Amino acid sequence: ITTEQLTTREVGGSGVFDALMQSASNHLLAEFKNNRITGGDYVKAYIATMEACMANAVQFLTTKDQAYWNAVTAQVAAITARANLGIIKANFVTAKIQAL
Amino acid sequence: SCGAELEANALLTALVAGEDFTLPDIDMSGSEYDIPGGINSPIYAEIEKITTEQLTTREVGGSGVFDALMQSASNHLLAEFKNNRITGGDYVKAYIATMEACMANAVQFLTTKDQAYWNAVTAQVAAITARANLGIIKANFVTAKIQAL
Secondary structure, three states: OOHHHHOOOOOOOOOHHHHHHHHHHHHHHHHHOOOOOOHHHHHHHHHHOHHHHHHHHHHHHHHHHHHHHHHHHHHHHHHHHHHHHHHHHHHHHHHHHHHO | OOOHHHHHHHHHHHHOOOOOOOOOOOOOOOHHHOOOOOOOOOOOOOOOOOOHHHHOOOOOOOOOHHHHHHHHHHHHHHHHHOOOOOOHHHHHHHHHHOHHHHHHHHHHHHHHHHHHHHHHHHHHHHHHHHHHHHHHHHHHHHHHHHHHO
Protein backbone atom coordinates (compact mmCIF):
# COMPACT_ATOMS: atom_id res chain seq x y z
CA ILE A 1 0.00 0.00 0.00
CA THR A 2 1.39 3.38 -1.07
CA THR A 3 0.17 6.95 -0.76
CA GLU A 4 -0.47 6.95 -4.52
CA GLN A 5 -3.31 4.44 -4.13
CA LEU A 6 -4.96 6.53 -1.40
CA THR A 7 -5.07 9.64 -3.59
CA THR A 8 -3.52 11.04 -6.75
CA ARG A 9 -2.43 14.66 -7.10
CA GLU A 10 -4.69 14.93 -10.15
CA VAL A 11 -8.44 15.26 -9.65
CA GLY A 12 -10.51 12.32 -10.84
CA GLY A 13 -7.65 9.83 -10.65
CA SER A 14 -7.61 6.21 -9.54
CA GLY A 15 -7.11 7.09 -5.87
CA VAL A 16 -9.73 6.08 -3.33
CA PHE A 17 -10.01 9.68 -2.15
CA ASP A 18 -10.29 10.81 -5.78
CA ALA A 19 -13.04 8.27 -6.48
CA LEU A 20 -15.20 9.57 -3.62
CA MET A 21 -14.80 13.16 -4.83
CA GLN A 22 -15.87 12.32 -8.38
CA SER A 23 -18.74 10.12 -7.20
CA ALA A 24 -20.02 12.84 -4.86
CA SER A 25 -19.67 15.49 -7.57
CA ASN A 26 -21.59 13.42 -10.12
CA HIS A 27 -24.58 13.00 -7.80
CA LEU A 28 -24.69 16.75 -7.14
CA LEU A 29 -24.31 17.50 -10.86
CA ALA A 30 -27.24 15.18 -11.59
CA GLU A 31 -29.57 17.58 -9.77
CA PHE A 32 -27.66 20.51 -11.28
CA LYS A 33 -28.86 19.46 -14.74
CA ASN A 34 -32.35 18.90 -13.27
CA ASN A 35 -32.67 22.67 -12.64
CA ARG A 36 -33.03 22.53 -8.86
CA ILE A 37 -29.67 23.82 -7.53
CA THR A 38 -27.63 26.83 -8.62
CA GLY A 39 -23.94 26.68 -9.45
CA GLY A 40 -22.97 28.50 -6.27
CA ASP A 41 -25.11 26.15 -4.19
CA TYR A 42 -23.60 23.10 -5.91
CA VAL A 43 -19.97 24.01 -5.23
CA LYS A 44 -20.72 24.92 -1.60
CA ALA A 45 -22.14 21.46 -0.89
CA TYR A 46 -19.22 19.82 -2.70
CA ILE A 47 -16.65 21.61 -0.52
CA ALA A 48 -18.49 20.84 2.72
CA THR A 49 -17.93 17.09 2.19
CA MET A 50 -14.17 17.33 1.54
CA GLU A 51 -13.08 16.26 5.03
CA ALA A 52 -15.77 13.57 5.21
CA CYS A 53 -14.53 11.92 2.01
CA MET A 54 -10.90 12.09 3.14
CA ALA A 55 -11.69 10.55 6.54
CA ASN A 56 -13.62 7.65 5.01
CA ALA A 57 -10.96 7.07 2.34
CA VAL A 58 -8.32 6.25 4.95
CA GLN A 59 -10.71 4.00 6.87
CA PHE A 60 -11.84 2.11 3.76
CA LEU A 61 -8.37 1.66 2.25
CA THR A 62 -6.80 0.27 5.43
CA THR A 63 -9.54 -2.33 5.99
CA LYS A 64 -10.21 -3.07 2.31
CA ASP A 65 -7.89 -6.09 2.18
CA GLN A 66 -8.36 -7.27 5.77
CA ALA A 67 -11.99 -8.28 5.20
CA TYR A 68 -11.14 -10.26 2.06
CA TRP A 69 -8.46 -12.40 3.71
CA ASN A 70 -10.59 -13.10 6.78
CA ALA A 71 -13.22 -14.57 4.45
CA VAL A 72 -10.54 -16.64 2.69
CA THR A 73 -9.33 -18.07 6.00
CA ALA A 74 -12.88 -19.07 6.96
CA GLN A 75 -13.39 -20.80 3.60
CA VAL A 76 -10.20 -22.85 3.99
CA ALA A 77 -11.13 -23.82 7.55
CA ALA A 78 -14.56 -24.99 6.37
CA ILE A 79 -12.97 -27.29 3.79
CA THR A 80 -10.51 -28.59 6.39
CA ALA A 81 -13.34 -29.18 8.87
CA ARG A 82 -15.22 -31.18 6.24
CA ALA A 83 -12.15 -33.37 5.73
CA ASN A 84 -11.86 -33.89 9.49
CA LEU A 85 -15.53 -34.93 9.55
CA GLY A 86 -14.64 -38.17 7.78
CA ILE A 87 -12.02 -38.89 10.43
CA ILE A 88 -14.69 -38.48 13.12
CA LYS A 89 -16.88 -41.12 11.47
CA ALA A 90 -13.92 -43.51 11.30
CA ASN A 91 -13.11 -42.85 14.96
CA PHE A 92 -16.75 -43.56 15.87
CA VAL A 93 -16.36 -47.16 14.70
CA THR A 94 -13.03 -47.36 16.54
CA ALA A 95 -14.70 -46.33 19.81
CA LYS A 96 -17.30 -49.08 19.41
CA ILE A 97 -14.58 -51.68 18.77
CA GLN A 98 -12.50 -50.48 21.73
CA ALA A 99 -15.47 -51.08 24.05
CA LEU A 100 -15.51 -54.74 23.01
CA SER B 1 -9.19 -76.11 14.84
CA CYS B 2 -10.35 -78.51 17.58
CA GLY B 3 -13.19 -76.10 18.31
CA ALA B 4 -10.87 -73.41 19.66
CA GLU B 5 -13.20 -70.58 18.64
CA LEU B 6 -16.23 -72.38 20.09
CA GLU B 7 -14.62 -72.49 23.54
CA ALA B 8 -13.85 -68.76 23.47
CA ASN B 9 -17.46 -67.85 22.64
CA ALA B 10 -18.86 -69.94 25.51
CA LEU B 11 -16.39 -68.54 28.05
CA LEU B 12 -16.94 -64.91 27.04
CA THR B 13 -20.73 -65.18 27.33
CA ALA B 14 -20.63 -66.79 30.78
CA LEU B 15 -17.93 -64.58 32.31
CA VAL B 16 -19.55 -61.27 31.33
CA ALA B 17 -23.13 -62.46 31.83
CA GLY B 18 -25.47 -60.40 33.98
CA GLU B 19 -24.81 -56.90 32.64
CA ASP B 20 -25.97 -54.84 29.67
CA PHE B 21 -23.42 -53.74 27.05
CA THR B 22 -25.56 -52.75 24.06
CA LEU B 23 -23.53 -50.42 21.86
CA PRO B 24 -25.36 -47.43 20.35
CA ASP B 25 -26.52 -47.82 16.75
CA ILE B 26 -25.94 -44.60 14.80
CA ASP B 27 -25.76 -44.31 11.00
CA MET B 28 -23.12 -41.73 10.06
CA SER B 29 -23.84 -42.12 6.32
CA GLY B 30 -27.07 -40.11 6.56
CA SER B 31 -27.42 -36.52 5.42
CA GLU B 32 -27.70 -35.38 9.05
CA TYR B 33 -24.02 -36.17 9.69
CA ASP B 34 -22.95 -34.48 6.44
CA ILE B 35 -22.61 -30.77 5.68
CA PRO B 36 -25.40 -29.60 3.33
CA GLY B 37 -24.61 -27.36 0.39
CA GLY B 38 -22.52 -29.55 -1.90
CA ILE B 39 -20.17 -28.50 -4.72
CA ASN B 40 -22.83 -26.03 -5.91
CA SER B 41 -22.97 -24.19 -2.57
CA PRO B 42 -21.80 -20.56 -2.37
CA ILE B 43 -19.18 -21.82 0.10
CA TYR B 44 -17.20 -23.28 -2.82
CA ALA B 45 -17.78 -20.13 -4.89
CA GLU B 46 -14.67 -18.07 -5.57
CA ILE B 47 -14.19 -15.08 -3.27
CA GLU B 48 -13.67 -11.81 -5.15
CA LYS B 49 -11.32 -9.16 -3.79
CA ILE B 50 -12.91 -5.95 -2.54
CA THR B 51 -12.19 -2.98 -4.81
CA THR B 52 -13.15 0.69 -4.74
CA GLU B 53 -15.44 0.03 -7.72
CA GLN B 54 -17.77 -2.08 -5.57
CA LEU B 55 -17.99 0.63 -2.89
CA THR B 56 -19.12 3.26 -5.40
CA THR B 57 -19.20 3.89 -9.14
CA ARG B 58 -18.41 7.26 -10.69
CA GLU B 59 -21.83 7.16 -12.38
CA VAL B 60 -24.93 7.92 -10.32
CA GLY B 61 -27.30 5.01 -9.80
CA GLY B 62 -24.66 2.35 -10.40
CA SER B 63 -24.09 -0.98 -8.69
CA GLY B 64 -21.96 0.52 -5.92
CA VAL B 65 -23.11 0.26 -2.32
CA PHE B 66 -22.84 4.03 -1.93
CA ASP B 67 -24.76 4.48 -5.19
CA ALA B 68 -27.51 2.11 -4.02
CA LEU B 69 -28.12 4.12 -0.84
CA MET B 70 -28.34 7.37 -2.83
CA GLN B 71 -30.92 5.98 -5.25
CA SER B 72 -32.92 4.32 -2.47
CA ALA B 73 -32.98 7.53 -0.43
CA SER B 74 -33.93 9.58 -3.50
CA ASN B 75 -36.81 7.25 -4.41
CA HIS B 76 -38.39 7.56 -0.96
CA LEU B 77 -38.20 11.36 -1.13
CA LEU B 78 -39.58 11.35 -4.68
CA ALA B 79 -42.51 9.22 -3.50
CA GLU B 80 -43.75 12.12 -1.38
CA PHE B 81 -42.76 14.53 -4.17
CA LYS B 82 -45.42 12.96 -6.41
CA ASN B 83 -47.83 13.01 -3.44
CA ASN B 84 -47.85 16.85 -3.54
CA ARG B 85 -46.42 17.45 -0.08
CA ILE B 86 -42.84 18.66 -0.72
CA THR B 87 -41.55 21.21 -3.21
CA GLY B 88 -38.65 20.56 -5.56
CA GLY B 89 -36.33 22.85 -3.63
CA ASP B 90 -37.27 21.14 -0.36
CA TYR B 91 -36.70 17.70 -1.89
CA VAL B 92 -33.17 18.38 -3.13
CA LYS B 93 -32.16 20.02 0.16
CA ALA B 94 -33.08 16.91 2.15
CA TYR B 95 -31.31 14.70 -0.39
CA ILE B 96 -28.04 16.62 -0.04
CA ALA B 97 -28.18 16.65 3.77
CA THR B 98 -27.90 12.83 3.84
CA MET B 99 -24.87 12.60 1.54
CA GLU B 100 -22.29 12.11 4.29
CA ALA B 101 -24.58 9.76 6.23
CA CYS B 102 -24.94 7.43 3.24
CA MET B 103 -21.20 7.47 2.55
CA ALA B 104 -20.33 6.69 6.18
CA ASN B 105 -22.73 3.74 6.34
CA ALA B 106 -21.60 2.42 2.94
CA VAL B 107 -18.05 1.87 4.19
CA GLN B 108 -19.28 0.25 7.41
CA PHE B 109 -21.70 -2.08 5.61
CA LEU B 110 -19.31 -3.12 2.83
CA THR B 111 -16.45 -4.03 5.18
CA THR B 112 -18.61 -6.21 7.45
CA LYS B 113 -20.90 -7.57 4.72
CA ASP B 114 -18.89 -10.76 4.19
CA GLN B 115 -17.64 -11.19 7.77
CA ALA B 116 -21.12 -11.94 9.12
CA TYR B 117 -21.80 -14.56 6.44
CA TRP B 118 -18.65 -16.58 7.10
CA ASN B 119 -19.13 -16.49 10.88
CA ALA B 120 -22.52 -18.12 10.35
CA VAL B 121 -20.95 -20.73 8.05
CA THR B 122 -18.34 -21.61 10.68
CA ALA B 123 -21.04 -22.07 13.32
CA GLN B 124 -23.04 -24.36 11.01
CA VAL B 125 -20.02 -26.58 10.34
CA ALA B 126 -19.19 -26.77 14.05
CA ALA B 127 -22.78 -27.82 14.82
CA ILE B 128 -22.54 -30.71 12.35
CA THR B 129 -19.15 -31.71 13.77
CA ALA B 130 -20.52 -31.55 17.32
CA ARG B 131 -23.39 -33.83 16.31
CA ALA B 132 -20.89 -36.36 14.95
CA ASN B 133 -18.90 -36.18 18.19
CA LEU B 134 -22.12 -36.85 20.12
CA GLY B 135 -22.13 -40.43 18.86
CA ILE B 136 -18.58 -40.87 20.13
CA ILE B 137 -19.71 -39.71 23.58
CA LYS B 138 -22.40 -42.40 23.69
CA ALA B 139 -19.85 -45.05 22.72
CA ASN B 140 -17.44 -43.79 25.39
CA PHE B 141 -20.25 -43.97 27.96
CA VAL B 142 -20.43 -47.74 27.54
CA THR B 143 -16.62 -47.90 27.67
CA ALA B 144 -16.60 -46.12 31.04
CA LYS B 145 -19.08 -48.65 32.44
CA ILE B 146 -16.95 -51.56 31.21
CA GLN B 147 -13.75 -50.02 32.59
CA ALA B 148 -15.31 -49.89 36.06
CA LEU B 149 -15.81 -53.66 35.96
